Amino acid sequence: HHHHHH
Amino acid sequence: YNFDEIIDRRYTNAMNVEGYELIRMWVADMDFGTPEVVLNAIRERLNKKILGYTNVFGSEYYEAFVSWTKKRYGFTFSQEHLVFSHGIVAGLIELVGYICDKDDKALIVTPSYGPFKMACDKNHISTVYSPLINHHGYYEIDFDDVRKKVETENIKLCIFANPHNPTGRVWSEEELATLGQIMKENDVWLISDEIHCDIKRSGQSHIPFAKAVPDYDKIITTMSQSKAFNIAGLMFSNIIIQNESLLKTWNTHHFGTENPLSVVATQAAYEKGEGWLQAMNHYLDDNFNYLADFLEKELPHAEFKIPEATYLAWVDLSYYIKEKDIDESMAKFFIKNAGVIIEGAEQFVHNAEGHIRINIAVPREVMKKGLQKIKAALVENLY
Amino acid sequence: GGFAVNYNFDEIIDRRYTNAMNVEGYKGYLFELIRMWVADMDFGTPEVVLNAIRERLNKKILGYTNVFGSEYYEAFVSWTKKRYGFTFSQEHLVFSHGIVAGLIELVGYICDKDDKALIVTPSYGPFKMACDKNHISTVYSPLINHHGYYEIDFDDVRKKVETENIKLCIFANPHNPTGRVWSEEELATLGQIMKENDVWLISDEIHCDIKRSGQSHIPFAKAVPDYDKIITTMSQSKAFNIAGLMFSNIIIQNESLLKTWNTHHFGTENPLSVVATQAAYEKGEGWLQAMNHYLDDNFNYLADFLEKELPHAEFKIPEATYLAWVDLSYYIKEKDIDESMAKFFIKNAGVIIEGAEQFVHNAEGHIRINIAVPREVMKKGLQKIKAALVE
Ligand SMILES: *Cc1c(COP(=O)(O)O)cnc(C)c1O
Ligand SMILES: *Cc1c(COP(=O)(O)O)cnc(C)c1O
């Protein structure tokens, strides 16, 4: 889960 | 330097490879090598054999960093104001908590880098969106919208990307001065995230927000070499806090120790990195020139403008989505139908419908293969 | 395993021009010098660890990294199983950028504004700092001391946990600065108090692989396996002299707290820190044993030197750590010193140690001496300490 994502 | 080199990224715990054969044009790190001047600075630090507790002592690091900002943008700042975080998002999460109370709001222009919002979410801070406007082809700030929201709502903080992700805008002095004036009149803090500031097209010049608006101490600047030198893994970022109270909170409440390999790598980039960086930017420019010609010829209904900064292409595929009534994520669509990983609109908060972001910090031959596959998937069963 | 190599812990390694806190930073932290203060080693980080970092650099790209797959977990859990009979599930393992950073976040998640934390004293100073940073009030339980052999005052702990609003206990196992390797019985006794009063326990086990020959480490969560409010923190930062790489293991067995952690620790690891730590777990056992043997000999020498040269000092060779805890009460009284002992030894002896001021409470008259240094360096420092104290 890349912290750039959501 | 050989930016064409294919560098194997398997078996490196890289998010870019493991986080989702496939062509990778998504997560914002490069497929280009971290330059040897940086890697060699790390290697000579290892030869001193001890990797103990470290902090930035003395003024050598400061001298290297401010020499870079002075030479490149004519921007200087005081050593007292320079503090460090473990990456820019870690910095933002901390700054937002210090600046904002629970009923304060933050303003972001949209579309936006997702973690601007996430940093507000984690501190239980509500975000207000001000959508950028697209009317000349390049994106622009809607100052009327910004003024309205700042005046009428309880906006404590604006988190701003200079240059912008994902649109690539390199804001002019006038754009910045105008926005700064709005923020100053309404006592709004501004965090200017300038991580893309050295990745830009030959004909563009970066102005730091704190250069454009030099007499407002609530402008906080964040800069790193993580994007420009492909050292995001080393998690070391600069934060320039000109406000004495916040600086004191940071110095008091901020628990901070540094990674010696991260510090030496970043320092080396500032001291010796300029030649490699200029060469990387020239190669990037050529990737963008190819991409612009390719979209014009092969995907004419796509809307695209070469971004002034970043290695990220923002492409409007609204036409193709509507003509095909594509009802899944465009990231899923391209993974299934093209074998290419991109970032879809879902990563950019708001004002992003129908867009993808393509990372073209990759060997040109990789980019071309990816673009061909994207095109084939979109024009399948279209006239 | 690395047992066949011949290591040289006598090697003098220059630490100037490395931004080392140990060399540059004593004034800010405490307030030609011989450095025996902050807990990093003067021994080199072992070549098996440094070579793992070099091999990662040869991969050319230092981008966004996380711990993917099972290989890291397998190496770590293989270590804890082999050495302490301690197993945990991969899902319970999360990561922090150093244990104190982890502690700061854990304290905030577990404690509400009105809740108190308990620490046994003397203590590692950042346990208290982590409560202060969260505006969490601390209650001290003074350890019982018999000539350098410290024990928990279980009646005091029970009384405090019962009559104060104690939500959390932060605990060093093995203990800094006293060096105690807690027995199963001691940990089980403390565990029963915590379970009976719904108190969380964070067990900081960063010293657990630095100990005298014949000592066995028992993880708190091994001693008390039934209770999911025991959190374990472990690292290779002390044992392998890689504190600057800021990578730590946190084992959270409580679902609610794990889910909370996982909402604020949105990954992002340092590839160099991860490969270095993994290399220690996979390949570092032989070097670590050699290191501990050399340390044991440093302690044997220090014990002899204090008995002969400073016979009014109280010192027991600790069961763990590379830290000597020395009671200098007699000499402090005689010489009538009323400045911090760290100031006194810098000014008078050119030696940097940690004084009572760094250990929160119940530390009067003590200093902590870091002896993870070449024997010859330790001998020099001790000579200067002695000269400053005697008549
Ligand atoms: C890529 C990017 C970052 C990177 O943040 P880290 O936390 O350092 O990974 C930060 N800000 C912006 C605007 C970006 O585009
Ligand atoms: C030295 C020490 C630490 C160091 O933790 P980091 O934050 O990883 O540097 C933690 N706990 C104890 C008990 C220590 O003695």
Coordinates of C-alpha atoms in Angstrom, one line a residue, chain B residues 87-352:
Chain B
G87 CA 10.5 12.3 3.9
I88 CA 8.2 15.1 3.0
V89 CA 4.9 13.4 3.9
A90 CA 6.2 12.6 7.4
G91 CA 7.1 16.3 7.6
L92 CA 3.6 17.4 6.5
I93 CA 1.9 15.1 9.0
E94 CA 3.8 16.7 11.8
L95 CA 3.5 20.4 10.6
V96 CA -0.3 20.0 10.1
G97 CA -0.7 18.8 13.7
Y98 CA 1.4 21.7 15.0
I99 CA -0.4 24.3 13.0
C100 CA -4.1 23.3 13.0
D101 CA -6.7 22.8 15.8
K102 CA -9.4 20.1 15.3
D103 CA -12.0 22.6 13.9
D104 CA -9.5 24.3 11.5
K105 CA -9.6 23.4 7.8
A106 CA -6.9 23.1 5.1
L107 CA -7.1 24.2 1.5
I108 CA -5.6 22.3 -1.4
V109 CA -5.8 23.1 -5.1
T110 CA -7.0 20.0 -7.1
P111 CA -6.1 17.8 -8.7
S112 CA -3.5 17.1 -6.0
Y113 CA -0.9 14.7 -4.7
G114 CA -2.9 12.4 -2.5
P115 CA -0.8 12.7 0.7
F116 CA -1.7 16.4 1.1
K117 CA -5.2 15.2 1.9
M118 CA -4.0 12.2 3.9
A119 CA -1.8 14.4 6.1
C120 CA -5.0 16.4 7.0
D121 CA -7.1 13.2 7.5
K122 CA -4.5 11.8 10.0
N123 CA -4.7 15.0 12.0
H124 CA -8.5 15.0 11.8
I125 CA -8.4 18.2 9.7
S126 CA -11.1 18.8 7.0
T127 CA -9.9 19.7 3.6
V128 CA -11.4 22.2 1.2
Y129 CA -10.7 21.8 -2.6
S130 CA -10.1 24.6 -5.0
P131 CA -10.1 23.1 -8.5
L132 CA -7.5 24.4 -10.9
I133 CA -8.9 25.7 -14.3
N134 CA -7.9 24.3 -17.7
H135 CA -9.0 27.1 -20.1
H136 CA -5.7 28.0 -21.9
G137 CA -4.7 24.2 -22.0
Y138 CA -2.2 24.8 -19.1
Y139 CA -3.8 24.7 -15.7
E140 CA -4.3 27.9 -13.6
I141 CA -5.3 28.9 -10.1
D142 CA -8.9 30.1 -9.7
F143 CA -8.0 33.1 -7.4
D144 CA -11.6 34.1 -7.0
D145 CA -12.5 30.6 -5.8
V146 CA -9.4 30.6 -3.5
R147 CA -10.3 34.1 -2.0
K148 CA -13.9 33.1 -1.5
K149 CA -13.1 29.9 0.4
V150 CA -10.3 31.5 2.5
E151 CA -12.6 34.5 3.5
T152 CA -15.8 32.6 4.1
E153 CA -14.4 29.4 5.7
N154 CA -12.1 28.7 8.6
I155 CA -9.0 27.8 6.5
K156 CA -5.9 27.8 8.8
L157 CA -3.5 26.2 6.3
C158 CA -2.9 25.8 2.5
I159 CA -0.7 22.9 1.4
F160 CA 0.6 23.8 -2.0
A161 CA 2.9 22.0 -4.5
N162 CA 5.4 24.3 -6.3
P163 CA 5.9 22.9 -8.9
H164 CA 2.5 21.2 -9.1
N165 CA 1.8 17.4 -9.1
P166 CA 0.1 16.2 -11.2
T167 CA -0.3 19.1 -13.7
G168 CA 3.4 20.0 -13.7
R169 CA 2.8 23.8 -13.4
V170 CA 5.9 25.9 -12.6
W171 CA 4.2 28.9 -11.0
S172 CA 5.3 32.4 -12.1
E173 CA 6.3 35.0 -9.6
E174 CA 3.0 36.8 -10.2
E175 CA 0.9 33.6 -9.5
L176 CA 2.8 33.0 -6.3
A177 CA 2.7 36.7 -5.1
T178 CA -1.0 36.8 -5.8
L179 CA -1.7 33.6 -3.8
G180 CA 0.7 34.6 -1.0
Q181 CA -1.2 38.0 -0.7
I182 CA -4.5 36.2 -0.3
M183 CA -3.0 33.9 2.4
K184 CA -1.3 36.8 4.3
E185 CA -4.5 38.9 4.3
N186 CA -6.4 36.0 5.9
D187 CA -3.7 34.8 8.3
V188 CA -3.4 31.4 6.4
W189 CA -0.2 29.4 6.9
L190 CA 1.3 28.0 3.6
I191 CA 3.4 24.9 3.2
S192 CA 5.1 25.1 -0.2
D193 CA 6.2 21.6 -1.2
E194 CA 9.0 22.1 -3.8
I195 CA 10.2 18.5 -4.1
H196 CA 9.9 18.7 -8.0
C197 CA 11.7 22.1 -8.2
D198 CA 14.8 20.7 -10.0
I199 CA 13.0 18.4 -12.4
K200 CA 11.9 20.8 -15.1
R201 CA 11.9 21.6 -18.8
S202 CA 14.9 23.6 -20.3
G203 CA 12.8 26.7 -20.7
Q204 CA 11.4 26.9 -17.2
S205 CA 12.8 28.5 -14.0
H206 CA 11.7 27.7 -10.4
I207 CA 10.8 30.5 -8.0
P208 CA 10.5 29.3 -4.3
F209 CA 7.3 30.5 -2.7
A210 CA 9.4 32.2 0.1
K211 CA 11.4 34.0 -2.7
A212 CA 8.2 35.3 -4.4
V213 CA 6.7 36.2 -1.0
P214 CA 9.8 37.1 1.1
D215 CA 8.0 39.1 3.9
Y216 CA 5.6 36.5 5.3
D217 CA 7.0 34.2 8.0
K218 CA 4.2 31.6 7.7
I219 CA 5.5 30.3 4.4
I220 CA 7.1 26.9 5.2
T221 CA 9.3 25.4 2.5
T222 CA 10.0 21.7 1.9
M223 CA 12.7 20.5 -0.4
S224 CA 14.5 17.2 -0.9
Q225 CA 16.8 15.4 -3.4
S226 CA 14.5 12.3 -3.1
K227 CA 12.7 12.9 -6.5
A228 CA 15.6 14.6 -8.4
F229 CA 18.2 12.0 -7.4
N230 CA 16.0 8.9 -7.1
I231 CA 16.7 8.5 -3.3
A232 CA 13.2 8.4 -1.9
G233 CA 14.2 5.3 0.1
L234 CA 16.7 7.3 2.1
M235 CA 13.8 9.4 3.6
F236 CA 15.6 12.7 4.3
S237 CA 14.0 16.0 3.7
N238 CA 14.6 19.7 4.3
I239 CA 12.0 21.9 6.0
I240 CA 12.6 25.7 6.3
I241 CA 10.5 27.2 9.1
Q242 CA 10.8 31.0 9.3
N243 CA 8.2 31.3 12.1
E244 CA 9.9 31.4 15.5
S245 CA 7.0 29.8 17.4
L246 CA 6.5 26.9 15.1
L247 CA 10.3 26.5 14.9
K248 CA 10.4 26.3 18.7
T249 CA 7.5 23.7 18.7
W250 CA 9.5 21.7 16.1
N251 CA 12.7 22.0 18.1
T252 CA 10.8 21.1 21.4
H253 CA 8.2 18.5 20.4
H254 CA 10.1 17.1 17.4
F255 CA 12.1 14.0 18.2
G256 CA 14.8 13.9 15.5
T257 CA 17.8 11.8 14.7
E258 CA 19.2 11.3 11.2
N259 CA 20.5 8.4 9.0
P260 CA 24.2 9.0 8.2
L261 CA 23.8 7.3 4.8
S262 CA 20.8 9.5 3.9
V263 CA 22.6 12.7 5.0
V264 CA 25.8 11.9 3.1
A265 CA 23.8 10.9 -0.1
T266 CA 21.7 14.1 0.0
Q267 CA 24.7 16.3 0.8
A268 CA 26.6 14.7 -2.2
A269 CA 23.7 15.5 -4.5
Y270 CA 23.9 19.2 -3.5
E271 CA 27.7 19.3 -3.7
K272 CA 28.4 17.3 -6.8
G273 CA 25.1 16.4 -8.4
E274 CA 24.5 19.2 -10.8
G275 CA 26.1 17.7 -14.0
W276 CA 24.2 14.4 -13.7
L277 CA 21.0 16.3 -13.0
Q278 CA 21.3 18.6 -16.1
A279 CA 21.9 15.5 -18.2
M280 CA 18.9 13.7 -16.7
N281 CA 16.7 16.7 -17.4
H282 CA 17.8 16.9 -21.0
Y283 CA 17.0 13.2 -21.5
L284 CA 13.6 13.7 -19.8
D285 CA 12.8 16.6 -22.1
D286 CA 13.4 14.3 -25.1
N287 CA 11.0 11.7 -23.5
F288 CA 8.4 14.5 -23.3
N289 CA 8.9 15.6 -26.9
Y290 CA 8.4 12.0 -28.0
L291 CA 5.2 11.7 -25.8
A292 CA 3.7 14.9 -27.1
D293 CA 4.2 13.9 -30.8
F294 CA 2.9 10.4 -30.1
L295 CA -0.3 11.6 -28.4
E296 CA -0.9 14.2 -31.2
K297 CA -0.6 11.4 -34.0
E298 CA -1.9 8.3 -32.3
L299 CA -4.5 9.5 -29.6
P300 CA -5.7 12.8 -31.1
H301 CA -8.8 13.0 -28.8
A302 CA -6.5 12.9 -25.7
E303 CA -5.8 16.3 -24.1
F304 CA -2.2 16.8 -23.0
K305 CA 0.3 19.7 -22.5
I306 CA 4.0 19.1 -21.8
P307 CA 4.3 19.8 -18.1
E308 CA 6.6 22.6 -17.1
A309 CA 8.1 20.4 -14.4
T310 CA 8.1 16.8 -13.0
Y311 CA 8.7 13.6 -14.9
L312 CA 4.9 12.9 -14.8
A313 CA 2.5 13.2 -17.8
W314 CA -1.1 14.2 -17.0
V315 CA -3.3 12.9 -19.9
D316 CA -7.0 13.5 -20.3
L317 CA -8.6 10.3 -21.8
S318 CA -12.2 11.4 -21.2
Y319 CA -13.1 11.0 -24.9
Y320 CA -12.0 7.3 -24.9
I321 CA -13.6 6.5 -21.6
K322 CA -17.0 8.0 -22.7
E323 CA -16.9 6.4 -26.1
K324 CA -16.2 2.9 -24.6
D325 CA -18.3 3.5 -21.4
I326 CA -15.3 2.1 -19.4
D327 CA -16.8 1.4 -15.9
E328 CA -13.6 0.2 -14.1
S329 CA -10.6 2.1 -12.8
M330 CA -8.3 3.1 -15.6
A331 CA -5.4 1.6 -13.7
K332 CA -7.3 -1.8 -13.7
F333 CA -8.2 -1.3 -17.4
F334 CA -4.6 -0.8 -18.5
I335 CA -3.3 -3.6 -16.3
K336 CA -5.9 -6.0 -17.8
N337 CA -6.0 -4.8 -21.4
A338 CA -2.5 -3.2 -22.0
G339 CA -0.1 -4.8 -19.4
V340 CA 0.9 -1.3 -18.3
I341 CA 0.7 0.1 -14.8
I342 CA -0.2 3.8 -14.6
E343 CA -1.8 6.0 -11.8
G344 CA -5.5 6.6 -12.4
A345 CA -7.6 9.6 -11.3
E346 CA -8.4 7.9 -8.0
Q347 CA -5.0 8.9 -6.7
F348 CA -5.4 12.7 -7.1
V349 CA -8.2 13.6 -4.8
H350 CA -10.6 15.7 -6.9
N351 CA -10.9 17.4 -10.4
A352 CA -9.2 14.4 -12.0

